[PDB]
């Protein structure tokens, strides 16, 4: 029995590496709180046709107040319901101002689609949890509401779809709830709730009878919406850039006088084997012939970039510097 082979050994191993709230940022030295999260179709399945019900914003504000210790919604005015795009995601930022009178924290809900201008969707104040919050006086028989396919109901105090369905039976289906007041949270994770109508608000109680949520007053109004259609208009502005402090440059100056002569010069320069930069000096772009020459030169540099300097000059002495500026189109 002979011994076996002697191997060389080295080590080898490979070690592995609330949606409504998302990220929470506290302003350094300030009591303002910014809630930043991403809104998309795959993140909010219950948001049908892009429209996000205002109850979702209400529940997000409830969670933010729970984080900040102000679950009682003193005020919530919905400027416009959130309509998410079918394609892409929208950045929504919740700005909660520093608490003021009676420890009420002002709250605003701005939203924007990527580069779309910021637009606020809800505004009001949040009050801290009072010692005694009486339920609003009942005005109608309590009705149980159940929503099929509630996703992550335990994540929220009341599911946004559940809250929207609860508020439909009180405010009205044809009216979108706009202003909210006195929203007090008493239970979290409830999947099925019973809505007890009041004069203005609504009670939300679990089937076991324990109070889950209260709204002292909620009102609804019809709503309509718009999107970005007027943002496709572009104007040719002329931001100023400082010319380089260069006293020399390689260029062929051409004082354009007509479109045909400019075209003849362009084709002659193209036929020229010499690698000499060509610059075209014209009149004001507002002039018809000067504009035609400018467009001709623009297309010429589109065909042959890096060999054209389109300069609208009132003093050709700065022509070389424009050539050394680096921008083919300079006025």
């Amino acid at each position: 029995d002979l011994p076996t082979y002697a191997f060389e050994h080295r080590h080898y191993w490979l070690e592995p590496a609330d949606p409504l709230l998302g990220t929470v940022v506290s302003t350094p030295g300030s009591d303002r709180l910014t809630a930043v999260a991403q809104w998309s179709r795959r993140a909010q399945p219950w948001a049908v046709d892009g429209l996000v019900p205002n109850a979702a914003l209400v529940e997000a504000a409830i969670r933010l107040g729970d984080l900040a210790g102000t679950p009682v919604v003193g005020e919530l005015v919905v400027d416009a319901p959130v309509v998410l795009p079918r394609r892409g995601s929208r950045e929504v930022q919740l700005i909660v101002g520093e608490p003021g009178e009676q420890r009420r924290r002002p709250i605003e809900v701005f939203s924007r689609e990527a580069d779309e201008p910021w637009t606020r969707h809800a505004h009001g104040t949040l009050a801290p949890a009072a010692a005694a919050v009486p339920e609003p006086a009942a005005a109608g028989d309590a009705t149980d509401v159940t929503v099929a396919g509630l996703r992550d109901a335990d994540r929220y105090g009341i599911h946004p779809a559940l809250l929207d369905a609860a508020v439909r039976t009180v405010v009205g289906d044809d009216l979108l709830p706009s202003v909210w007041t006195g929203v007090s949270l008493l239970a979290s994770g409830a999947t099925a709730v019973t809505v007890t109508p009041t004069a203005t608000g609504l009670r939300l109680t679990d089937p076991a009878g324990q109070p889950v949520l209260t709204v002292e007053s909620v009102r609804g109004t019809p709503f309509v919406a718009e999107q970005g259609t007027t943002d496709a208009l572009f104007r040719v502005d002329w931001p100023e850039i400082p010319l380089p402090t260069a006293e020399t440059a390689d260029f062929l100056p051409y004082e354009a006088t007509s479109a045909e002569a400019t075209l003849s010069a362009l084709q002659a320069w193209l036929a020229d084997p010499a690698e000499t930069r060509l610059a075209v000096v014209t009149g004001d772009c507002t002039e018809p012939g000067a504009a035609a020459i400018w467009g001709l030169v623009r297309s010429a540099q589109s065909e042959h970039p890096g060999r054209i300097v389109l300069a609208d000059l009132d003093d050709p002495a700065v022509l070389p510097a424009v050539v050394a500026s680096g921008e083919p189109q300079v006025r």
């Binding site: 990527a114 580069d115 259609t229 007027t230 496709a232 208009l233 572009f234 104007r235 970039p305 189109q329």
Partner: protein, 83 residues
């Protein structure tokens, strides 16, 4: 009001001859299709505005990504694709 209308999503007589290479070249330089109803809305908005404007769809995100990747951004679209 003079509007530099882009390649309309509705096929017109001028755009009879643009081949697939032409659409790909236009989309590469940010020139996209112009929807019909959006074209009418842009015409109304431009008549409200007036002047020399451009009503075309420019992919801001892709142009910005190309600028960050080192692609040659045209000088006119450098404002829409900042560096």
């Amino acid at each position: 009001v003079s509007i530099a209308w882009g390649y309309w999503a509705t096929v017109s007589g001028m755009t009879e001859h643009l081949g697939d290479a032409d659409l790909r070249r236009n989309q590469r330089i940010g020139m996209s299709g112009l929807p019909a109803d959006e074209g009418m809305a842009l015409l109304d908005a431009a008549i409200a505005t007036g002047g020399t404007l451009v009503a075309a769809k420019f992919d801001v995100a892709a142009l910005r990504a190309t600028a960050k990747a080192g692609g040659p951004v045209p000088p006119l679209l450098r404002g829409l694709a900042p560096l």
